[PDB]
Amino acid sequence: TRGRVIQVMGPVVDVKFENGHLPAIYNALKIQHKARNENEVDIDLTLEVALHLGDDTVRTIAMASTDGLIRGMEVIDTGAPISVPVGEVTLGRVFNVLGEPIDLEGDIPADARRDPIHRPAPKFEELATEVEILETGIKVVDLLAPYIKGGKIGLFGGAGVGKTVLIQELIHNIAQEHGGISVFAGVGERTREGNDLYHEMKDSGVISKTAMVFGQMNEPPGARMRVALTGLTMAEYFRDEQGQDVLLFIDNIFRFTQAGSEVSALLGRMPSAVGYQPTLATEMGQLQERITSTAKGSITSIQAIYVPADDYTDPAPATTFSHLDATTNLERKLAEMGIYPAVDPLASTSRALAPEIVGEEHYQVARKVQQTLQRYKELQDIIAILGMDELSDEDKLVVHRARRIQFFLSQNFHVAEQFTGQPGSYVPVKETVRGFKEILEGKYDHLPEDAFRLVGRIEEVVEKAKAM
Amino acid sequence: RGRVIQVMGPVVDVKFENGHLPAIYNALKIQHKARNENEVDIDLTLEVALHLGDDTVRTIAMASTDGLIRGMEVIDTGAPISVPVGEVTLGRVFNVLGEPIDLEGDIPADARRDPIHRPAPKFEELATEVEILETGIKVVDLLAPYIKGGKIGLFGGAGVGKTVLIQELIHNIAQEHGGISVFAGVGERTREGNDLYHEMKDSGVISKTAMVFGQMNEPPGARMRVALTGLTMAEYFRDEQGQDVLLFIDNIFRFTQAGSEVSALLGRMPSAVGYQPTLATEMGQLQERITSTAKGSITSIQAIYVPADDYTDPAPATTFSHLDATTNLERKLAEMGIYPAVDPLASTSRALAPEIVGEEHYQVARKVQQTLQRYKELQDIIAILGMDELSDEDKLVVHRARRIQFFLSQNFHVAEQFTGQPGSYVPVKETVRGFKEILEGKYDHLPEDAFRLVGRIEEVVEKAKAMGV
Amino acid sequence: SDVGTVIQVGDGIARAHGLDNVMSGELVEFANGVMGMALNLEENNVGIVILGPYTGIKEGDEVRRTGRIMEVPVGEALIGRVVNPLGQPVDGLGPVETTETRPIESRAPGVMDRRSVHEPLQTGIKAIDALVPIGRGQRELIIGDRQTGKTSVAIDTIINQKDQNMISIYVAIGQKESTVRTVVETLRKHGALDYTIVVTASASQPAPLLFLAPYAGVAMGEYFMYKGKHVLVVYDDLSKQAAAYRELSLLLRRPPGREAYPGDIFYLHSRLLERAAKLSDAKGGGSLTALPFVETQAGDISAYIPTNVISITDGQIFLQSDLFFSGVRPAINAGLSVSRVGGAAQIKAMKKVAGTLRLDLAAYRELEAFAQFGSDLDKATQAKLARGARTVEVLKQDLHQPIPVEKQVLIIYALTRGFLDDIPVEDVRRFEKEFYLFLDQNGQHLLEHIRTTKDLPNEDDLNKAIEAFKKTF
Amino acid sequence: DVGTVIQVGDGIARAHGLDNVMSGELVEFANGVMGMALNLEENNVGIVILGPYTGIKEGDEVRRTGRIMEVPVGEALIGRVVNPLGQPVDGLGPVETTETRPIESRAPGVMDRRSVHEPLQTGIKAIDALVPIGRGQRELIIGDRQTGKTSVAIDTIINQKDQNMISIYVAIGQKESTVRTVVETLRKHGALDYTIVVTASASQPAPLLFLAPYAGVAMGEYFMYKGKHVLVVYDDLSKQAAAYRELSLLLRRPPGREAYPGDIFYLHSRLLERAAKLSDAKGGGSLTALPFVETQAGDISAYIPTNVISITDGQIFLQSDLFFSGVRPAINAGLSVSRVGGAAQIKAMKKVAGTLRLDLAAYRELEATQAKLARGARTVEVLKQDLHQPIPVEKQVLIIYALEKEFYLFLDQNGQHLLEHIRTT
Ligand SMILES: Nc1ncnc2c1ncn2[C@@H]1O[C@H](COP(=O)(O)OP(=O)(O)NP(=O)(O)O)[C@@H](O)[C@H]1O
Ligand SMILES: Nc1ncnc2c1ncn2[C@@H]1O[C@H](COP(=O)(O)OP(=O)(O)NP(=O)(O)O)[C@@H](O)[C@H]1O
Ligand SMILES: Nc1ncnc2c1ncn2[C@@H]1O[C@H](COP(=O)(O)OP(=O)(O)NP(=O)(O)O)[C@@H](O)[C@H]1O
Ligand SMILES: Nc1ncnc2c1ncn2[C@@H]1O[C@H](COP(=O)(O)OP(=O)(O)O)[C@@H](O)[C@H]1O
Ligand SMILES: [Mg+2]
Ligand SMILES: [Mg+2]
Ligand SMILES: [Mg+2]
Known part of the structure; x- marks a missing residue:
């Protein structure tokens, strides 16, 4: 049948x-x-x-x-x-779209078990819903929008805001110390990033329990469309046929939608809003619904989502927002101010921020921090127009503690070494909550705000202050 | 076939x-x-x-x-x-096709049926004869009087009070001027259509009104032709019966959107905010048949929904070019209890000049407008500084301005459904007399709540007595 | 003429030849058994929308007309289950044992078949129950940004209907299956499943199922409406239904509209929402209350679908992100919210206090812009600002914490009468807690009077109870 | 294997009868104008003209070259100015070459590259100290009109003289007079001893502007795959994006966010991903890239700027406050960030100046701590820069470490006892 x-x-x-x-x-x-x-x-x-x-x-x-x-x-x-070839052979190897190895480690045996990349999502009676806090060590993430083990997490960002660096710290802080299995799928990311991450994974001894799929920006739209499905198949075999906990990283899931949009007009489909595909939502849902936890095993999925033209109301990020448990929004304005990870403390919310999931103290401090930051944002216009002196004493205290909190929400990254020359930090959730509860109480009012930038625990703030 | x-x-x-x-x-x-x-x-x-x-x-x-x-x-x-026209039409509810959707029988086959599409009356068949139409609403009769044969637009948001104001206009005009009224439910809410029919039937206006409902759950063609159906009924009543006939239209916005959806379904390229290219032509073809001719007159009152308070939207902006009088219904007043929530300063009328309403009426209306404008300007100062900071004249102007502000609100004959209090009908002469007396300082000693919701200034005195002043 | 061959298959749609006698909206069957709806009928081509996995359909495959409009099975068995638009269960609890079907596309009750809505649907949310009243038979839209409390408000509404004979339907459309499962389990934990039907149309489902889901939900609700029962149907997002219908139309080569949305998209919502009605005693007191949802992107209520759904509904509750993040829960914009039923859907006791509350909030919204100078403002302005602050603290509620109507009336009475002007603002919530217990300890007669007569009790006794509690506090 | 043109529009033709034409082939028109076959349909072949299309008329025969989109390359291109098709445009005679490279060649895989291990000494203080660039980086230069971007590229190519690295200049949509001035500036500084210049002026058709950076990348690829090191500068990628938008719209392709096509990301991606630092097994060659983007009113959150930022490994934001504010070239260090980072610099520079960028970002934030503000203004003033003269890093590292023309002369005139130690290490 030729x-x-x-x-x-x-x-x-x-x-x-x-x-x-x-x-x-x-x-x-x-x-x-x-x-x-x-x-x-x-x-x-x-x-x-x-x-x-x-x-x-x-x-x-x-x-x-x-x-x-x-x-x-x-x-x-x-x-x-x-x-694509799936099973034990995938571990410690790197594949292109078609599941063919590219790591110069040899050809996968022909008789290996292969699985299709197109399958329906698990049915309603199959998914397992349960919220358990996944500790990342990142102050803002674990405080204002904690991640869920087995849930779906989205790092929304524009161009050059910190999606890839955040992905690297999540791998360095979480995947290294976890005894499950890991899969990384590079969808529309830079080949330099893929090579650097592969080296960082090998020299850290983690590649032994990791599979990789790489189809990058230099590749045609079809490759960028099906990389995510190939990686999903690789993780889904581990979830279903082994029942092991899986960590699935996708450094840009937006490029799948973008590549589908590139071929939309040529396929013969009328333009939708903003020139996207008419079937943007359905095509995205047929993929994001396969990324899920099941009674067989959990999948902790972390996807970075690129935001075109720094517009969160774009059809692709807006449609993606309904597929994720935890969401992290990366802001260009915060990045320009030196506040990294440039996580938006307000627009980023997670299903796990509940009094019965993270406790009453954590919920109270997170909500108080968010209220203070929103109050500061609203007071900024009055400060611009009237001034600082015209503010009331309560508003002055609010601005003080809001600047302190906004600086203290930043922390030095491990992956920031090559960007800062400074070693990274790991902050336990208890330390984060205690530090922010003490900041709101006024225990550290007198410390200059400069000491709160790129810091670890709260005592590191006073240690930095001794340097002035 | x-x-x-x-x-x-x-x-x-x-x-x-x-x-x-x-x-x-x-x-x-x-x-x-x-x-x-x-x-x-x-x-x-x-x-x-x-x-x-x-x-x-x-x-x-x-x-x-x-x-x-x-x-x-x-x-x-x-x-x-x-569409059936005439005596058989009165006291009945029809759809866009003229079929009676009530259970009170149907229309006989052997009856006069008029087409709903017809050219507007010619240039020499027209007749310009300006005469004020008395409605009974103090704020309307004072600051924005209506004219016979005119097109009066009630612009508003979501809950300002356009439909209850149309209900009062129907009821008051039927009970006092004894005129024939036609109602066009353009994109009518079946709930509000039921309520309108019940309140027409209960108050006896059923025999002076003929309702045409184009249901909101109907295809756009019906929703954009039901206005023409109501207009055809009104035009028969104007011509072959002679006496003034009123035509109330549910919402012009929903007729423009029905037209826009019809054009989009037909495949024509959109204009402005997605609207139909022929929007102006269609609105003209509607509003140009509502004219006073040698045989008679058709007054029209149309409610216009302004989305997101965007008056530059194609539907309200295009409607603005046909309206002799425009009344703006503001949610801010409605939340304060002021009804019909008519904006005193944004309400404009073609006939607010001495040559149509008289020197006294125009002078009183202009003085009220000036006092309200001064109060609006003084709002910020009275909010920040105390009333003591104002001069004696500013104190007097605010003192009177609150009295006028509440006094423009009147109890509604239909609001007895909502608040239970019986309504009132205020003649234009008594309206201007009351506002003149208020502006003269005759009642600066009455607390403002006396003017809250009444018909006449004598009712203000009676209410002030009622509170124990 | 009853059998054709599909000539084009793709992206959830098909085009067939020779279905000469097919009706618009009919059902067709493919060689693999997957259903489809014949939507577009053309000169020598029939547009079919695929109601299943379309991977198994290839060009040249047989298609057979069924001569049957879609019918959703419905009965008393569906209560407590989770099904798809076709009525097939999605949980593992076995098949649903119904014995009657209702057409998915059915006429709404006429103008004379309805009655003025007069009995309140008690939401349990003080801001909604006071300032945006809802009654049985109303169409009320909840519109807001993402992550503001739409689904939470609907779930709390369904929770509150335990002892109100107030049957509920929850149409989950476009949500990921994990979210729907969490919704189902949190309804079960609070015991709502005893009177709730859940219709599921997740993202991975074919787009026509998303399009049809609210139709199936309202069809299930109409069965209980026609028997005299009261039904509540909640659509968790009509925006995603509109998106799915636009996708179908664009694939079917229909001319675009305002934002590539179809020309008849308005129709699609309206004929749905206007199926929610309250019937007269001749047809039975059964009613249906609709709660459509709409998501706005940049708080932009000026789009196409938001404007349409705002036009259709009898009232809109605007949820604001800036209110959600400022500590105002559940972030109801009582200034921009509207209800055309109003007092007709309130207890008389609730009306008498909600009018004064609305007056207070209207006064307070006139002095927010002056709060920038609030340290040195006028005495009357300061008093109004303080009363507004106490009011916004009173209206604050927590998640999954419905409040009985009598206690809402009593707390609003205490707020309006000026008994809260002496306590500090930050304590108001604590007040609103402890006072409630005080009532359940001593004020049982007042609550019973409100529950029986549906009217405010004797005011001097109420004042005495308030004074006694203030002494206790 | 010859066809007849049936339509010819604004530089896009449709021919009939090219049965065996490969996608992306090269085709010869009757008057000798090159073209590239873009789309192949059932009955006709879509061709894109690569030159003056006014001489091409319907009915003119078109022949098949049998070769994919290729550009000539070799050692003879050094010092020459050629169009995107490799035909010389200066009055220096023909270019004698032997090898050709495909235009759309595949980028090296993920295992063929290595981390940036060596510096590309641009010769500007802020660029070499605050936003470092490596030998395999793709560093984007982004800014408004003026703002001295072409000046930065010229200084880079000039300073590469002592380095053993070939340089390439690609001019997209620039004025041919400006290209002539730049070429003569490179000639007067001896930069043409190792530099190739590819030109596509504004008067040229959109296809040539679209095609030029691919030709430059292939020309650099020939040297990088041979083991040598290359530096490629695209004089404006925004103009190439505009040319591609025009070429696509002429083909009746529905537009996207800002009338650009859907490919406008991919179009740049497959370009800047061919710039890489190959591994030691692959010969050790490299190809640095310096894309240029012009921003309207300095708005960086636009569509094409964000595309290119998503593709490149950093950016240098040259803000408009140069010729009405001085201190040119001013650097918006809160936004100019190098993603390779301290691996690019030498050990001494990384030691001395690893904290400048965060200090500058914090200072720009606080101008919306008296000692911090004083030190920040000092950090702003120290990085002041001179004219087109490169400044060597070896004497500049200690000048940076001081926190200075007097220091510049004092350091070297007192002997090289400090210079040679860092020139060796
Ligand atoms: N904790 C941090 N400390 C310092 N710099 C940081 C930190 N986190 C991120 N950055 C900087 O953020 C910049 C952006 O890099 P990157 O993480 O690749 O953004 P990006 O989102 O991946 N761009 P793209 O993936 O193409 O959309 C880098 O240059 C880092 O130096
Ligand atoms: N009344 C409330 N008080 C406190 N927190 C609340 C309240 N209502 C909702 N939340 C929180 O807000 C989160 C948002 O939930 P949800 O109600 O689904 O928002 P939403 O409007 O449905 N946005 P989405 O579901 O993504 O379309 C919940 O998970 C709760 O954590
Ligand atoms: N450090 C400097 N000191 C003084 N003049 C400078 C400096 N850098 C650049 N210039 C001048 O700035 C002008 C613009 O330089 P140029 O590099 O061409 O900007 P540009 O990016 O090319 N803007 P455009 O012409 O649209 O391409 C030239 O006249 C340079 O001589
Ligand atoms: N004159 C009035 N007196 C008391 N309440 C009124 C009056 N007019 C309107 N309302 C209240 O406001 C609501 C306005 O509804 P409606 O007038 O139908 O809205 P619209 O003006 O948008 O048509 C009514 O439901 C009623 O409760
Ligand atoms: Mg990245
Ligand atoms: Mg209305
Ligand atoms: Mg929701």
């Missing part, structure tokens, strides 16, 4: 199966052609069927560069979706 | 004979009995929207299109939607 290429575009290719035996949707197709003379180029390309058309025709999205494709080329049908 | 070839929601394409095509806006009927148990009975009415060629027309449905089968015959009535 096919023939009839049309060629950048990321999409149209194929014709004249024998009345069409592939199903998501079926994999192969172009494997050798240059028959000097005027062609040998090509080895993988296509993924996306739509059916009239008269025995299928629209597919190529997984690599389409340059060199010639109309009338032979097509092989694999009879199944893209099957 | 044609046949339906394409169905895409509330849009139906019908193919006819090679030369016997219907006209634009013509009404077509689909009445189909279920031939088998796999289909359903169909009773649907379409309006020919435009022509596609190849003996095909594109039409808009005035009922649910579910259950239509390609190929079932379509009846070409040869004329636009026909």
